[PDB]
Symmetry: D2
Subunit: 498 residues, 4 copies
């Protein structure tokens, strides 16, 4: 016996001691007499349409694949629970937080960003850390990253950013000119670029990295009072990264390093956990904040906004079938129960639309019917009907229009959203110049030490060297605005590669 992941089939076989193997059938349940030979007219004759056993199986094989996620395609998944450890009901009325000790089942999927389905785990790229909370008030999806910020602050630039991070439209090759032309033209990315090219750019698996909601969200309590917040989930396994060299070696030796690591950890009882926190900022404090509290390229300094403990995230169950439970799982940031709402973060606002929209495409109109996506701890009752692959009773004969006089589902007033008064013109406000350096300089000078700065620069230069000179200059010009020693160190490294 090797690692648990390797022994998957052996264990499956063993669990079935009373080896009476099931009868092999067609999709419609008809028993198959011989699924090892096709029907022909005579030993060396042609194949007949009459062989439905063949067609039935082949037609399905021909349809096994579904579109991969447009971003975050390569990932790993696990399941467990969320347990409340502290009382934050003064901030939020959400049932998931109602009592200390209350557990809510969770589903999680970790992932890289740019790489497709057959790409390596151990590569520099941010990491996805999505959490699905199956609450009594429906599903709550906290779709986070392993960073508290992001590259851009306006959603209309997201498709372009992702395009620049992927393959050239003609050559289908990664293109550093694309990567850096966009980044140098859009210096808002300076903060996240700095995080990305640091040591945490390549975590040692999924268990040794933090998780963040990134966006600023809104919490509403029972009295209707609201505050803005941030979600943080620190790894109880401690931060641990892979060196550029080891990451390179592993991407070849085991492209599925992250998947294997997580499966084996759980299989052997080493269940990973994260301590769940929140930062709180009142509406009054939001007015005085030195930056836009809804700018996704900014963090809320811990000094001024201390982490407030809330609970724990524990992963103790591996998927039984990867496609059904991981590949098909869908997280929608808009899935929020009463007590948790969205903030005016332009980026968050854009995601409110994007996720359900893309899910209806890659999964299907009724993707919420898929078991792993089904809000099984809440009764779904509404006036929505039909659609492709309607896998339930489609709500039977219940009246399908609202309002009605026949006893069908009623709206619950207490669930109404929190209302705020906004003022200003309805138009496109430019945010390209919303301070792209202040917090980046703080990160460079105060958070990192000498060794870490040297590596950051070496990592940046190592990739930037392949972009054209004019792109290198504009990129260095941006790093120099962050801190003159930051830009010059990179320029020096570039000079020698050139």
């Amino acid at each position: 016996s090797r690692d648990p992941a390797s022994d998957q089939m052996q264990h499956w076989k063993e669990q079935r001691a009373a080896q009476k193997a099931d009868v092999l059938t067609t999709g419609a349940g008809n028993p198959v007499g011989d699924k090892l030979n096709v029907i022909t007219v005579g030993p060396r004759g042609p194949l007949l349409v009459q062989d439905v056993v063949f067609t039935d199986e082949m037609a399905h094989f021909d349809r096994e694949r579904i579109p991969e996620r447009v971003v975050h395609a390569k990932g790993a998944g696990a399941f467990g629970y969320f347990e409340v450890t502290h009382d934050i009901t003064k901030y939020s009325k959400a049932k998931v937080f109602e009592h200390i000790g209350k557990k809510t089942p969770i589903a999680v999927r970790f992932s890289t960003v740019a790489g497709e389905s057959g790409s390596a785990d151990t590569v520099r790229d941010p990491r996805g850390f999505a959490v699905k909370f199956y609450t009594e008030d429906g599903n709550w999806d906290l779709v986070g990253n392993n960073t508290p910020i992001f590259f851009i602050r306006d959603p209309i630039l997201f498709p372009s950013f992702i395009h620049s991070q992927k393959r050239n439209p003609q050559t289908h090759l990664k293109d550093p000119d694309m990567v850096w032309d966009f980044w140098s033209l859009r210096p808002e990315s300076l903060h996240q670029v700095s995080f990305l090219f640091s040591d945490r750019g390549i975590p040692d698996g999924h268990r040794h990295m933090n998780g963040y909601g990134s966006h600023t969200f809104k919490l509403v309590n029972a009295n209707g009072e609201a505050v803005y917040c941030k979600f943080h989930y620190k790894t109880d396994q401690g931060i641990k990264n892979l060196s550029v060299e080891d990451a390179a070696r592993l991407s070849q030796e085991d492209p599925d390093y992250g998947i294997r690591d997580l499966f084996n950890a759980i299989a052997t009882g080493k269940y990973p956990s994260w301590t769940f926190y929140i930062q709180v900022m009142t509406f009054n404090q939001a007015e005085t904040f030195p930056f836009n509290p809804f700018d996704l390229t900014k963090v809320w300094p811990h000094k001024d906004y201390p982490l407030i403990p809330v609970g724990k995230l524990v992963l103790n169950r591996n998927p039984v079938n990867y496609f059904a439970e991981v590949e098909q799982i869908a997280f929608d940031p808009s899935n929020m129960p009463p007590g948790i709402e969205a903030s005016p973060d332009k980026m968050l606002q854009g995601r409110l639309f994007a996720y359900p929209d893309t899910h209806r495409h890659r999964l299907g109109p009724n993707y919420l019917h898929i078991p792993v996506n089904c809000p099984y701890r809440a009764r779904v009752a509404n006036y929505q009907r039909d659609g492709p692959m309607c896998m339930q009773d489609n709500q039977g004969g219940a009246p399908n229009y609202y309002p009605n006089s026949f006893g069908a589902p009623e709206q619950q007033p207490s669930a109404l959203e929190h209302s705020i008064q906004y003022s200003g013109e309805v138009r496109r406000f430019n945010t390209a110049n919303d301070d792209n350096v202040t917090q980046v300089r703080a990160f460079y000078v105060n958070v990192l030490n000498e060794e870490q700065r040297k590596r950051l620069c070496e990592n940046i230069a190592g990739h930037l060297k392949d972009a054209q000179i004019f792109i290198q200059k504009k990129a260095v010009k941006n790093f120099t605005e962050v801190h003159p020693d930051y830009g010059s160190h990179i320029q020096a490294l570039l000079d020698k590669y050139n």
Copy 2:
């Protein structure tokens, strides 16, 4: 109170007397505060993306429709059971017939052919009568209709026939030139055309017509001996048709006459039933038969091949949700359990492919996952996996390749199909010139009386009059070959219409 159908919502309401209305939720189960007004900026301001309650419902509304059936789009469904009354185990070893008194759950769908989803029920058109038997050896789909024969004998002509029966490609109107140009050019249609234009052309609802498998099938017993057969299911309600005038009036008064009739009959306890029979022809008889026993335009004379009683079909349950149970139901002629197999009928052979093929398009790759299509009385175990909208557990962590040394499903020797010897050239054999008039003449002459023949002719002439003169002549020439009186009477009526 009116008919049961009208009181659908009222009864639903009453059945929930001592209950509180459910909470209206989003698709993800999040309670909704107000689903009667959208979120806007101020009383007369723009709509916000934040209103995910709105877009969650709208998006689903936008995706309610799926493609209708390419043919037989307009229909009605009901459920019940099939009961064995006689012992035919000497002919077939199929479990569905294993013992007298055995009941098997069934699902049925009645329909017209050419009309789309919003067409009228009472129109001259053959009628679909598909029966799905949920047996222990998988689902057995007997996709029959109200006639023992069909218009053509080769499947490669089916798409063309259907096109001719539907709308003109440019105008989108019914086109009698298309209809009769095809029928006149393909005289093998004379038999079913004669049945269609007779009184049997417009049944009084679905309960007053017979059901037939039409094709010749093959039965195999426990010793491996096989015979050919026909499936017949005669109405216990008695044959009742509608007159041309009544059918036209009803098509305007109640386009859903068949749906209502069936629903009300079942809702009032008047469960419709059919007596199930089979005709048997030994391989030896198949050789001496005057025509091609596998020619779909020919019947097996009752005098030479008597009906052998087998059982009863009873419909005692209305669907609860039409879309999920009727619109989404899928019957595949290729769905046959051990003991029942296909025959070399060219038409049936073509149907072995078309149905699951159109179902993978209409419903989706995993259409067999939809409840009503699921072979719930059987255990589905194989090596098929994944695909869009994959429900259930996708067969867990079971070994996905065959053969394997890990205890996964195994083929069952007893399920092996019956072998028949064939020899000859592998090519396209013309069947256009097979007998196209003999059996038709017997029908025109003996099966029908003088009064019925008159109507047949005026029904034909009534529609044919709108086709060009050259098409009329060609069609009349065909009728004249069946019987001089047949052609002359039609020509006489055409003469005055013209």
Copy 3:
């Protein structure tokens, strides 16, 4: 020869004197030797998979259908042009209006609302009248109908309203309880319900009805000044309707009356046209209007807001292939060129989202690539790429991200939208209690005469009689609120029916 529609095939044949038919090929262009018989082993043997000609054709046949429109499924289409006859550049800078005499190609589709694809044309229901203008500034879709108003004033009730108008989820039959439970519970529908059950409820074809954009839209001129407007296109053939008896008779005789009528009119040179007008309201006037100027259930009195002539709409070309040019045509209200914008009408706002959304489902992600939907008089250049059935060069090797330093497409500042400053909280504002009777009373009293009010009441009572008494009472209560005579007349008729 008969009418042009009937002679479609004949004319096609004729336009080919030297009738040497083209060679019959597979989808891949391989010539077919015999498409009338399939390949079998021996004259009475089984079908071979080797018969690719069969499968190729059958497989396409099995996939001919696509989902019908969720609403307005039944319709007809035609093509022509829009011609500017008057100068309104003082209100709008849109290129389509830039100069008197300017001609822009248009596409139009007329339709009913509730019935499915095989339903009748001559039924009571509003009528769709969508116009696609292929301008140099892209496509402009004015998705109108034959009434200036609608049943509801908030988009979130649309799915429910439509459900109440269609079939019972269990019985699949039209349900008057659903129809009237909804309408009586939402009296804002009184205005459009009064219009619907009036003579204009069943137009005599599409050529004899008016067109209206219904909603309030916004126009912006070169100076950046804006005004609100209404779009009107009056029938030059004059208003003409069908009596209840004639409409009923025709729904039986010719379910495709509207299609035939339109086709034959254009085919014989009787090209229908409409005079295009607009009503203009200043932002100042919008502040003093007695009702909400953006309420879909209200009209702008002509006395206070006169029609201002703009141009002509002429349909002079029939479709060559219905499926390709009509069934697949897609109109998006959000398709507006510079100079034409949306207003804060909650209903319009909702439609901005719904159409493109439903089109991505019904047609596909790249539905704009379908010839009839392609903005062929404009150059499409952006950063959108890929997606299923990408039928173009996919913009070749052009840089796929914005911004970029490589010459890819740039935004055009002059196209920037008009900006307004709105005030108030961001929440759901209830409009259920806005004025629901005032304009309706005027309609009943002034717009109609004694003779018309009599028919109106009979039509309403004729359908309402089949709803339960409690629903009849609630409905009459609302009608009475509009005018005593209105309610008492319906009740009197209802009394005899009951």
Copy 4:
């Protein structure tokens, strides 16, 4: 830098005195600002009326289509096929009508088991599909870089692929799955020997051969038929990558094959292949020692010499990868008059699968996609409608056959060649056909000691991770090929173990 890297720069340059196009929405409406969304106030929520944003975002959300069930990772190119010799005595297909005749072609090279973001330089067979756009329609020769395959019956294909891919629970490559299947189905011995040899990892796509693999049927002008094999030998020469170098490249450049081919064509180094055929008469098909339609068998060159026919030349790169490569579709059933199938069970199964999988991956009207459209033939038939129906949908032409209105007619000269058969319509077992003879000829005569050593090391290196009982079964099969083959692998396994 290499041409590949300068893609955007060259694009910019080709548009010297041009001026950028106006950025528009999908519907052609000019865009004023596509860098900021519409909000109420500088810090307010997003509005639904920002259709510029939705139009773009909704499309981004739909960019992905399912990848090929197999052969997902690949590279494409275009060029022509030129006839150099006359084989019209064997086939009447227009593509071979005269010396010098050039026909446009589309080619896609690929691996097999890996998904879209996987490495090019890994052990795996290679796909070498060729689409010939002929006057008689498209001819798709969907080949591999091997003349044989692992199995001989199509019903085992889904299982084989499954064993080559990821474990259903762990989503990891599983050597138990790989070897349990191969050891249980020894017919795979021949192709497994090819796979684990030096040619298991070619140096790019230009340094490998292509084969149609299956036995096909050629019919000439007087309706006479013979069986054949298609072979296309690399004019650049066979060149492989060592295991160490392949490993390094898989990390250094997962898109090595793509880059190599692109730059080669970009710099004028147009790769070519010499196209040949092998011919076997119907009589020789009777005398052949094995089943001539058995995919695990080759026709010895000594008895069936390579007959030269023409050249395959790749001289044009894709302008848009998604459009010309990701969306390209090859159907083995696409054969013009003069070229037919043979009773090879594997080929017969492919006749169904490809068009079938294409209707799912691309769509019902996938043949309407430019790269797949048979542009050098007039398509005319009775097929209509379907999703994303581009074109005129054949206009108002009569849609039923037969008709009296002048619509398309069948052409009698296009009829298939008929053969006589006799037998029961049943499932005949082929699991026990010869699984070792030709394999032995490969191990003994074709390879030398260095190569046999490398072969055994390659096999043991991977086989070592499977359970012992699987190892023994595998070794048992290799032993049946040659004692020295199994003993050497076992000795290496003893060591790794």
